[PDB]
Design a protein around this ligand. Structure first.
Ligand SMILES: OC[C@@H]1O[C@H](O[C@@H]2[C@@H](O)[C@H](CO)O[C@@H]2O)[C@H](O)[C@H]1O
Length: 403
């Protein structure tokens, strides 16, 4: 940071991250604070509050020592000078090639590198094995295609049980919707953006299949749980956690809660990679938060001590693997989970297999995550409305390129 492994001298370091990653953030900070003189003062911020909080703090130069941001948000923040240039420190890491590359790439602008992985968050398919058995489905057969996803959701919908639906769609969360829907497109070998991130390529047969799948469930009695049309992103993981949804895309960072509920006598959870339109094709969204040292830090060496510590396979095993969470370190993924719950090892295989993507655009929030983004309207038109996929896609590109 200035020293190789930074300075551990009893400095209080501030770290900001977001509510969806709260369980993993707690584990990381608890472990750091138990093993260092330095202490991290953790703030966990609601997902939708980070843009305005970071923007406001940038203007009053009160950004924290360590800022973690959604990997889709980082390219913009890094372009605005939110982060201190740590190119030489990242480039000195012996194990740089083991670190989740999408998170480093998110923070790469003009040869400068600003970020490392903080918490990996990947999208997977989860299903309720109890509802599957009740519906006459094989409880171990996750969907291998978007068609099979529809069939399984429809059999759970046909149970006609109070508050039970086949699937659930985060209708008003552009962010949840990229996370949940992009992988089906990538699984098929299609793209959602051009290489620059300046154009949307969403008007494709795989995206149309995915939207038509959710349209079918929208037009099925009990197809999509109540709340799907209004879901802001604040509650989208709750209906499945509550045992009310047959099958849906889901964050790996929320699965440990499900595995725990199951150990405590709750319903049994299936996990599989998100499938393509094409039988047996799979992908994921290589998301989560990357972290950098803010432009406002007066403890760069102490912040670097945290950044350095977390990249090590030791810390990655302690804070991720030993807590049943997916690590940001591929060497940790390949070595530290040999006796983990098979569903954890299945989740890790969607990183190791290499079929996932991290979308990179300076305009990503404005085009995708933002409330009433062109992407949110595109999905809404296609699922609950009349879609014009060509027109809606061009609305996304007009934000991506303008400017
Ligand atoms: O934001 C894009 C990726 O999706 C996941 O985050 C989601 C939020 O956008 C949504 C609103 O909270 O909750 C989801 O967990 C990944 O963490 C992001 O990289």
């Amino acid at each position: 940071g200035i020293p190789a492994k930074g300075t551990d001298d009893g400095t209080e370091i501030t770290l900001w991250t977001r509510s969806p990653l709260e369980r993993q953030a707690k584990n990381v900070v608890e472990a750091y604070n138990k093993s260092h003189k330095n202490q991290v003062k953790l703030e966990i911020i609601p997902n939708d509050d980070m843009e305005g909080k970071v923007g406001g703090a940038s203007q009053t130069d009160s950004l924290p020592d360590i800022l973690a941001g959604d990997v889709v948000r980082i390219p913009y923040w890094a372009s605005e000078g939110i982060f201190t240039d740590i190119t030489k420190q990242i480039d000195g890491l012996d194990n740089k090639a083991d670190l989740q590359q999408g998170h480093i790439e998110a923070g790469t602008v003009d040869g400068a590198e600003y970020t490392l992985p903080f918490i990996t968050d990947v999208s997977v398919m989860v299903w309720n094995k109890n509802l599957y058995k009740e519906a006459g489905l094989d409880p171990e057969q996750g969907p291998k295609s978007i068609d099979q996803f529809v069939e399984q959701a429809k059999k759970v919908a046909a149970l006609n049980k109070d508050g039970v639906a086949g699937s659930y769609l985060a209708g008003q969360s552009g962010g949840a919707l990229v996370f949940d829907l992009f992988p089906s497109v990538w699984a098929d070998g299609e793209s959602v953006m051009n290489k620059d991130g300046s154009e949307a390529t969403l008007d494709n047969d795989s995206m149309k299949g995915v939207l038509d799948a959710y349209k079918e469930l929208a037009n099925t009695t009990n197809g999509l749980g109540a709340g799907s049309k209004e879901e802001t992103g604040a509650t989208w993981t709750a209906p499945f956690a509550n045992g009310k949804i047959g099958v849906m895309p889901y964050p790996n960072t929320s699965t440990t809660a499900l595995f725990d509920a199951e150990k405590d006598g709750g319903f049994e959870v299936g996990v599989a990679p998100i499938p393509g339109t094409k039988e047996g094709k799979t992908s994921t969204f290589l998301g989560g938060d990357a972290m950098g040292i803010s432009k406002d830090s007066k403890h760069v060496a102490q912040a670097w001590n945290f950044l350095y510590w977390l990249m090590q396979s030791d810390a990655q095993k302690e804070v991720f693997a030993d807590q049943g969470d997916t690590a940001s370190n591929i060497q940790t993924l390949k070595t530290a989970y040999k006796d983990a719950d098979p569903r954890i090892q299945t989740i890790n295989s969607v990183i190791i297999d290499g079929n996932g993507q991290t979308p990179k655009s300076p305009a990503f929030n404005e085009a995708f995550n933002a409330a009433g983004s062109p992407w949110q309207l595109l999905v809404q038109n296609a699922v609950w409305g009349s879609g014009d996929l060509k027109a809606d896609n061009k609305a996304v590109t007009d934000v991506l390129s303008a400017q």
